[PDB]
């Protein structure tokens, strides 16, 4: 049976991303906005049970839970054409609707207050999952609901489901824009602290990078939350294609990620997408070669993760997994890997054997693909620590000025101290040190308390 995945969409940005992800999954699986499989979706070769539940013999309901401490985002999901697609028992809306006020501590306190209700909703969604693997959280780290309520929900899931994996897609605040939310760095720090203690994987979504991509590639001067949510839905669809296009390998998330995550602390993931094309260029399915794919993936413009320029740590790639979708020749993959090695197109870990993994995936048969070849890059790169160091520096910049800290001090999680911010800074420092060690042969002792 498929390993069902519960999708948690938290706060305004997270909830929009989750809603659009469920929409994208329905479109890829040929599920109508009401949750019914379309008559053209006759290829029963997809694993809906990983991401969808069957509502009836004909209706597939996404295994998605939309969670907010403010009712607006949940209502907006329920106000979409896909409102009938999701099982209503898997929809949790905070009764108070007030959100966390962009305070992570407030969101955590609200989650603790709604712990019973939230876990009842989670169990209701879980019962629709035949073999639920775990929860995927879509949220923002800068707000209150997606950061704070997300952290609280993660804590309560860890307490109730201590043997299940918890991955998060955490939207980080824009680091190049001065946030008007002076406590946004504080909220982000508290959320990152909780992700460090209670989450197993945090997917960092930098709103600065989303805005930059929309500006340079989508020509969007002011990227809306909706455009970011649509990009997230495209990313989620690409990430779930291997569930939707079953094959010989990588049929489960844990099998794919086991090779990428050696230690629990190195749980900061970077993403990549290829080929990057503007929406207008969908028409021409370019016969992209494996060498051309690898060359385009190496461009920072195509990487879906905004890692800071760490000047102190000799950041390197530990490992790379490329998930390629479309027509892929194995001999072309082999020749591409050979050329990459000869050209040193990929740097591997210095403490053990490492290479660039290449996965070939089929496209969804129910969704016509405008591109002959598509690709996801998974990479372990020490520069992802620089993103965490930058978040820590922003927290310290707010904390050192105590800016907007009174709003977090209003909430119990931050009422007495800002220890969650200091723990976030310490965790980001430890991540930087391990990431620098992971570029070195002494990585064999990286993460050992004697090396820490």
């Amino acid at each position: 049976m498929p390993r069902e995945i519960i999708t948690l969409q938290l706060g305004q940005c997270g909830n929009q991303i989750g809603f659009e992800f469920w929409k994208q999954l329905c479109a890829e699986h040929g599920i109508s906005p009401e949750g019914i499989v379309e008559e053209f979706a006759t290829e029963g070769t997809d694993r809906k049970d990983v991401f969808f539940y069957q509502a009836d013999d004909e209706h597939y309901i996404p295994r998605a839970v939309l969670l907010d401490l403010e009712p607006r985002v949940i209502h907006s999901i329920l106000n979409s054409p896909y409102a009938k697609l999701y099982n209503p028992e898997n929809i949790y809306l905070s009764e108070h609707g007030g959100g966390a006020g962009n305070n992570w501590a407030s969101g955590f306190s609200q989650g603790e207050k709604i712990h019973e209700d939230i876990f009842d909703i989670i169990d209701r969604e879980a019962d629709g999952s035949d073999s639920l693997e775990g929860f995927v959280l879509c949220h923002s780290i800068a707000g209150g609901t997606g950061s704070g309520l997300g952290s609280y929900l993660l804590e309560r899931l860890n307490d109730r489901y201590p043997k299940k994996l918890v991955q998060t897609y955490s939207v980080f605040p824009n680091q190049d824009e001065m946030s008007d939310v002076v406590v946004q760095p504080y909220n982000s720090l508290l959320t990152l602290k909780r992700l460090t203690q209670n989450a197993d994987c945090v997917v960092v979504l930098d709103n600065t990078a989303l805005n930059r991509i929309a500006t340079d590639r989508l020509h969007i001067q002011n990227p809306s939350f909706s455009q970011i949510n649509q990009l997230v839905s495209t990313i989620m669809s690409a990430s779930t294609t291997t569930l939707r296009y079953p094959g010989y390998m990588n049929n489960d998330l844990i099998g794919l990620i086991a090779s990428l995550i050696p230690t629990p602390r190195l749980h900061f993931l970077m993403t990549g997408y290829t080929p990057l094309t503007t929406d207008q260029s969908v028409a021409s399915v370019r016969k992209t070669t494996v060498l051309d794919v690898m060359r385009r993936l190496l461009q920072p413009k195509n990487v879906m993760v905004s890692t800071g320029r760490d000047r102190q740590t000799n950041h390197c790639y530990i490992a790379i997994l490329n998930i390629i979708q479309g027509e892929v020749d194995p001999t072309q993959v082999h020749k591409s890997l050979q050329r990459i090695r000869e050209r040193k197109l990929a740097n591997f870990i210095p403490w053990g054997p490492a290479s660039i993994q290449v996965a070939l995936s089929r496209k969804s048969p129910y969704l016509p693909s405008a591109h002959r070849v598509s690709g996801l890059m998974m990479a372990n790169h020490t520069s992802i620590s620089s993103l965490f160091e930058r978040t820590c520096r922003q927290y310290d910049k707010l904390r050192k000025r105590e800016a907007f800290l009174e709003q977090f001090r209003k909430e119990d999680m931050f009422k007495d101290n800002f220890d969650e911010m200091d723990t976030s800074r310490e965790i980001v420092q430890q991540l930087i040190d391990e990431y620098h060690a992971a570029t070195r042969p002494d990585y064999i002792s990286w993460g050992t308390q004697e090396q820490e």
């Binding site: 060498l291 051309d292 020749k335 050979q338 050329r339 000869e342």
Partner: protein
């Protein structure tokens, strides 16, 4: 038509006669660092992979006969191969044909040659003597 004589000639010009100067410039710019190694230090598989990668990354990727282009590692350096060619039209041809391949670990630039796989009966035209020349 069947032996693609004109296509074979265009491929030879592109690769053996360096007609695709932008392609050859790109290929040599990419491959110079690996080819600069001594032949004993040169990994033939690495040179072949770099050749194919430059070919796909250069304007040689635009050559329709590029798939007929193969890598040939000459047993002698470019200087010894050149001396053999200079002797070919001279009575020294027998002396240069019997000249042992230069013991000097030729750089990949000096070891670089093209090969062309010609099948029978088309191999009657691109003969081994012509291919060697």
């Amino acid at each position: 038509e069947e032996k693609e004589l004109v296509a074979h000639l265009r491929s030879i010009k592109r690769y053996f006669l360096m007609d695709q100067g932008d392609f050859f410039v790109h290929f040599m710019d990419l491959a110079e660092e690996e080819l600069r190694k001594p032949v004993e230090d040169i990994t033939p598989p690495r040179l072949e992979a770099l050749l194919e990668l430059a070919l796909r990354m250069s304007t040689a990727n635009t050559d329709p006969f590029k798939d007929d282009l193969k890598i040939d590692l000459m047993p002698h350096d470019l200087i010894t191969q050149l001396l053999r060619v200079l002797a070919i039209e001279t009575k020294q041809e027998k002396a240069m044909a019997h000249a042992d391949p230069t013991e000097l670990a030729l750089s990949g630039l000096e070891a670089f040659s093209f090969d062309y796989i010609v099948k029978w009966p088309l191999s009657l035209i691109i003969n081994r003597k012509a291919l060697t020349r």
